């Protein structure tokens, strides 16, 4: 049986399974405790029990193994990993480990692992002889990540406007500069849906920082790819280590020539958490934010690259502006030139209830020649030069009106060039 | 003789009963001591006595049972609860327990429990088989919680303005941002009156932190639901204790598919109490607040959710701004985007003594489409569009004039659309 199989079950199953196995009062305690008790009960019987999850390396090799569906929460069900097999298998943070697990002995309250049978969805010997992520030489974006679903959905206009506005490809470094109440959440939702539909091969990851629980639940129940979120209730160190786990897992996955995509909401909140967790270095900029505090997020946002050998790590992270707190924009101008893809959203368009509220004139993508063919690039250039004089609200209303009466992007282009 | 019913009766009747029961003095000490003396005399008479209250768990199972009448104050009237009963019936903090009570033997001075006959207003056997609040999947608010009183009064006007400013539903997480002397207290009065009048089924409780005793007495003698308050005389430890007791009781109640509503005045004072009670973590932010000191209040404010299984927990906590103390706006910055409903009040409108003083443009709610219908949603949309341009003072004057002209919200909407 699988520990992951237990964790994917709902909460009520504790009555069906826990009580049937002889447990007395699993009704009233935290879910990880129910999982721990049931799996201890099953282990006492003696049958083989499986396990899997993402590896974490502590400061002294006191390794742990967390679960993705639990948002990497430190719980009793975490799998202990001694330094001996860490040295033997040359493991590190972010490694996906699957195999046998051992019932705890006296003096231990964590389930250690007997022997691993899969590392990063591959044999341990094949995973051992893999070069590090940072040794890989980056490149520019080559493969285009088209967001046009093509299913004729009623919400597909957002994806179409995204395709016309800013091209997204493998290995880009993207920013979504938007005010509050502008449509960031469901824009990222549409991006995730389009990625899951058009590109099932690439691994899709969504990361949510200090977000309300209802949005977390909706995101979990909507996107097909795995999503990890930490709420605002949880402390700053929780946010930091969740982000570290996500980035290490992405690096390990892309080390195997796999395309990884990370949607981040939001880089501003992650930067705030890093600022409030990093010890003061004596140099504080305007807004009560340390200098080296932004150093850690940039690395997280700097891992987006197109690996020459194989694979690509794409990061689309949204940023917050004009929230009333000056720290937000103070972070903002430290992130302007660091991204190669940028998308502006404006409050004024959202006020007119016109969605998606995209500032087409100001948003754009650099080095787009390497990502698209010349003919549709020329069509986009013609659209840009005929849309530049118009105001952003006028531009969006005209664009949605024109796109409503078409079917696909090519149909829109041919209709536009006919006129 | 119920302990609660004798607590409800004022001090004069307690003294009269003590005199009639052959007890000397009992006139120059606190209410708890008088109640203890009366209960001791009745126990020595020999008749069976029973009580009720809310459980509290200490650090070693040294269980106590408080009463909401005395605002959860630690006194002789509290009821002892042994760890044996806790392990037997599977109790935890916040459980509402009623049943037989026992006079103390030699060596102890606290009442024990012979047996429990009601747990959380339910049979004790069925109370154990309940899922934790942390294991319940949150959702967005679905059922609209209308605030319009509908009796055609004049204070209901304020409530009517609420239905025009920000929709409130079951499970909202709302913040009332207001400067000093802007109408917070009687706005909460109106909200509590509407809750107790339109929605008698839902459980309403009002929590007051470091509020003046006269305001506490005004609160208690007006609202229908039970109210708990701690004045600024008591130390911050009692503020934290009362807030934790309230949130635990709300969680226990909502675990039974009940609708719980909490009104908090104010979250800033609770944050101050947590800051001045939590030990320093070595990382102090601007304003003299510890980094993790704000972790605890957020949890209290993060419990507002709509449970898919059943029931809901709504929290309306007010916040203070422009008070001249930097800690207040630091806390406000740390609580800006955490809530899904905002109600902004301004001293500018209150200066002209136009009430309610609401910053209509800034105030609003998040994705109210799941709460209300459509046609009145477009009614509110066009009302916002036509009220957006002019200033807040003029907007409120126009709104109160038009609302006084009509009778109900539907009448207001039809009068607006016909003209
Ligand atoms: N493509 C769209 N179609 C229809 N309505 C939309 C669309 N995009 C946005 N909206 C509406 O605009 C609002 C956007 O809400 P959200 O996306 O939740 O806001 P947000 O970007 O998450 O910012 P926060 O979280 O509130 S600070 C909602 O009222 C939506 O109904
Ligand atoms: N709806 C209303 N009708 C009539 N008078 C009102 C109304 N709302 C507010 N006021 C007046 O405005 C003031 C509001 O007083 P409070 O609500 O007690 O102030 P507050 O918001 O509680 O701030 P604090 O706690 O006193 S610093 C009083 O002078 C009221 O008479
Ligand atoms: Mg959002
Ligand atoms: Mg007041």
Task: DSSP for B209-276, please give it.
Answer: ES--HHHHHHHHTT-SS-EEEE-TTS-HHHHHHHHHHHHHHHHHHHTTT-EEEEEEE-HHHHHHHHHH
- Rounded to whole angstroms, the Cα distance separating B108 from A375 reads 90
Residues facing residue A264 across a β-bridge: A207, A317
Token pair for A282? 């004596």
Q: Compute and round to an integer the Cα radius of gyration of chain B.
A: 24
Query: H-helix or E-strand containing A173?
Result: strand A173-178
Exposure string for B333-356, b = 16+ CB within 10 A, e = fewer = bbbbbbbbbbbbbbeebbeeebbb
Closest protein CA for atom 28 of ligand 1: B367
* Residues having CB within 6 Å of any atom of ligand 2: B 155, 158, 180-186, 355-356
Find the length of chain B. Answer: 419
Q: Is the CB of A183 under 6 A from ligand 1?
A: yes
Cα dihedral B411, B413, B418, B419, rounded to 10, equals 110
Instruction: Tell whether the torsion through CA atoms of A85, A87, A93 and A97 is positive or negative.
Output: negative
The answer, yes or no, to whether any atom of ligand 1 lies below 6 A from the CB of B221, is no
CA distances from B337 to A42, A111, A323, A324, B77 (A): 44, 39, 9, 11, 42
Longest Cα pair distance anywhere in chain A, in angstroms?
Answer: 80
Which two three-digit tokens encode residue A129? Answer: 């002889």
Measured between CB atoms, which of B130, B306, B366 is closest to A28? B130
In contact, B64 and B245? CB cutoff 8 Å: no
Technique used: cryo-EM
Chain A touched by B132 (CB under 8 Å): yes
Helix H or strand E encompassing A71 = none
Q: B-contacting residues of A 176-195, CB under 8 Å?
A: 180-181
d(CA A51, CA A67): 10
Cβ neighbourhood burial of B373 (10 Å; 0-12, 13-18, 19+): exposed
How many angstroms separate the CA atoms of B328 and B324, rounded? Answer: 8
Residue nearest ligand 1's atom 15 by CA: A183
What resolution (Å)? 3.1
* Strand ranges across the sheet with A116-119: A111-112, A79-81, A63-66, A50-56, A96-100, A116-119
Q: For residues A185 and A211, what is the distance between their CA atoms, to the nearest angstrom? A: 11
Which residue carries 């003396």 as its tokens? B37
- Dihedrals phi, psi of A28, to nearest 5 degrees: -120, 85
- Report how far apart, in Å, the C-alpha atoms of A67 and of each of A75, A95, A387, B17, B209 are: 10, 12, 48, 63, 40
Cis peptide before A202, with omega less than 30 degrees from 0?
no
Backbone angles phi, psi at B221, to 5 degrees: -85, 10
CB neighbour list of residue B80: distance below 8 Å, 6 or more residues apart: B63, B64, B65, B104, B108, B110, B111, B112, B113
- SS3 category, A126: helix
Residue with tokens 């209509």: B360
Is residue B322 within a helix (H) or strand (E), and if so which, with residue range?
A: none
φ/ψ of residue A272, rounded to 5:
-65, -40
Evaluate whether B113 touches B79 at the Cβ level (below 8 Å): yes
B366 lines ligand 1 (CB under 6 A): yes
Q: How far apart are the first and last CA of chain A?
A: 64
CA B313 from chain center: how many Å?
A: 11
CA A79 to chain centre: 24
Identify any residues that bridge with B259 across adjacent strands, giving them in sequence order. Answer: B312
β-strand pairing of A203-211 with A259-265: parallel
Residue bearing the CA closest to ligand 2, atom 23: B181
Nearest C-alpha neighbor of B78 from the set B33, B26, B45: B33
Q: How far apart (Å, rounded) are the C-alpha atoms in residues B393 and B193?
A: 26
B52 φ/ψ angles, rounded to the nearest 5 degrees: -155, 165
Q: How far is CA A345 from CA A178, A230, A327, A349, B225, in A?
A: 5, 25, 20, 8, 45
Strand ranges inside B108-202, DSSP E: 116-119, 138-139, 173-178
Q: Strand pairing partners for B64? A: B56, B80
- Measured between alpha carbons, how far is B243 from B228 in angstroms, rounded to an integer? 9
Q: Which pair of structure tokens corresponds to residue A336?
A: 């302007």
Provide DSSP, B36-87.
Answer: HHHHHHHHHHT--EEEEEEEE--TTS-EEEE-TTTTT--STTSEEE-HHHHH
- Residue A241 CA to residue A223 CA, distance in Å, equals 23
- Cβ atoms within 10 Å of B62's Cβ, excluding its own: 13
Tokens at residue A184, please?
């960031």
Alpha-carbon distance of B345 to B176, in angstroms, equals 7
Question: A363 to chain B, minimum CA–CA distance in Å?
Answer: 25
**Residue A389 tokens, joined:** 């004089």
Answer yes or no: do A276 and B286 touch at CB < 8 A: no
A218 inside 8 A of chain B by CB = yes
- CB contacts < 8 Å between A and B, how many? 74
The backbone torsions φ and ψ at residue B80, rounded to the nearest 5 degrees and listed phi first, read -65, 145
Q: What is the number of helices (H) and of strands (E) in chain A?
A: 16, 16
**CB proximity B10 to A under 8 Å:** no
Report d(CA A114, CA A97) in Å as an integer: 12
Q: How far is CA A50 from the centre of its chain?
A: 27
Cα–Cα nearest to A249, from A53, A8, A6, A76: A53
Phi first, then psi: give them for residue B384, nearest 5 degrees.
-65, -40
CA distances from A397 to A134, A201, A402, B147, B388 (A): 45, 35, 9, 37, 21
- Residue reference for tokens 């932010």: B285
Task: Report the C-alpha gap between A96 and B316 in whole angstroms.
Answer: 43
Q: What distance in Å separates the CA atoms of residue B202 and residue B90, rounded to the nearest whole number?
A: 26
CA B246 remoteness from chain centre: 7
Query: Mapping DSSP to helix (H, G, I), strand (E, B) and coil, where does residue A113 land?
Result: coil
Q: Are B225 and B199 in contact (CB under 8 A)?
A: no
Per the listing, tokens 């938007």 go with: A178
Contact between B361 and B392 (Cβ < 8 Å) = yes
| Dihedrals phi, psi of A38, to nearest 5 degrees | -65, -40
**What kind and span of H or E run contains A99?**
strand A96-100
Per DSSP, the residues of A131-156 read --TTTSPP----SB------S--TTH
Instruction: Please judge whether A214 and B138 are an interchain contact, meaning their C-beta atoms are less than 8 angstroms apart.
Output: yes
Atom of ligand 1 nearest to the CA of B368: 29
The answer to whether the beta carbons of residues A191 and A358 sit under 8 Å apart is: no
Distance, in Å, from the CA atom of A232 to the CA atom of A209, rounded to the nearest integer, reads: 7
C-alpha to C-alpha distance for A36 and A67, rounded to whole angstroms: 13
- At residue A126's C-alpha, the angle toward residues A123 and A130, to 5°, is 135
């Amino acid at each position: 049986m699988n520990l992951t199989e237990l964790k994917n079950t709902p909460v009520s199953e504790l009555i069906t399974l826990g009580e049937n196995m002889g447990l007395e009062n699993l009704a009233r305690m935290r879910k990880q405790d129910i999982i721990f008790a049931i799996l201890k009960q099953h282990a006492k019987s003696g049958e083989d029990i499986f396990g899997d999850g993402v590896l974490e390396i502590l400061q002294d090799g006191f390794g742990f193994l967390r679960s993705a569906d639990s948002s990497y929460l430190a719980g009793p069900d975490d799998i202990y990993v001694s330094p001996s097999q860490i040295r033997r298998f040359n493991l590190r943070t972010g490694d996906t480990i699957s195999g046998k697990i051992r019932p705890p002995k006296e003096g231990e309250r964590y389930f250690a692992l007997l022997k691993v049978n899969e590392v990063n969805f591959d044999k341990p010997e094949n995973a051992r002889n893999k070069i590090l992520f940072e040794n890989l030489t980056p490149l520019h974006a080559n493969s285009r990540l088209r967001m046009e679903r093509g299913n004729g959905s009623t919400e597909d206009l957002t994806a179409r406007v995204l395709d016309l506005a800013s091209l997204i490809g493998r290995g880009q470094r993207g920013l979504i500069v938007a005010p509050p109440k502008a449509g960031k959440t469901m824009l990222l939702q549409n991006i995730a849906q389009s990625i899951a539909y058009n590109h099932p091969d690439c691994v899709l990851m969504v990361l949510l920082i200090d977000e309300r629980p209802e949005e977390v639940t909706e995101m979990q129940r909507l996107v097909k790819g795995e999503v990890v979120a930490s709420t605002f209730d949880e402390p700053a160190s929780r946010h930091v280590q969740v982000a570290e786990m996500v980035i290490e897992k992405a690096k390990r996955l892309v080390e195997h020539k796999k395309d990884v995509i990370i949607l981040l909401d939001s880089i501003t909140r992650l930067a705030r958490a890093y600022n409030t967790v990093v010890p003061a270095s004596g140099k504080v900029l305007t807004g009560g934010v340390d200098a080296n505090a932004l150093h850690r997020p940039k690395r997280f946002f700097g891992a987006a690259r197109n690996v020459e050998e194989g694979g690509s790590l794409t990061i689309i992270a949204t940023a917050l502006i004009d929230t009333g707190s000056k720290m937000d924009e103070v972070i903002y101008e430290e992130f302007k030139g660091t991204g190669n893809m940028e998308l502006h959203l404006s409050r004024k368009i959202a006020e007119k209830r016109v969605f998606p509220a995209i500032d087409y004139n100001r948003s754009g993508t650099r080095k787009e020649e390497l990502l698209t063919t010349q003919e549709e690039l020329q069509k986009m250039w013609i659209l840009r030069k005929i849309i530049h004089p118009m105001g952003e609200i006028d531009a969006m209303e005209f664009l949605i009106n024109k796109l409503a009466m078409t079917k696909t992007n090519d149909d829109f282009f041919e209709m536009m060039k006919r006129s």
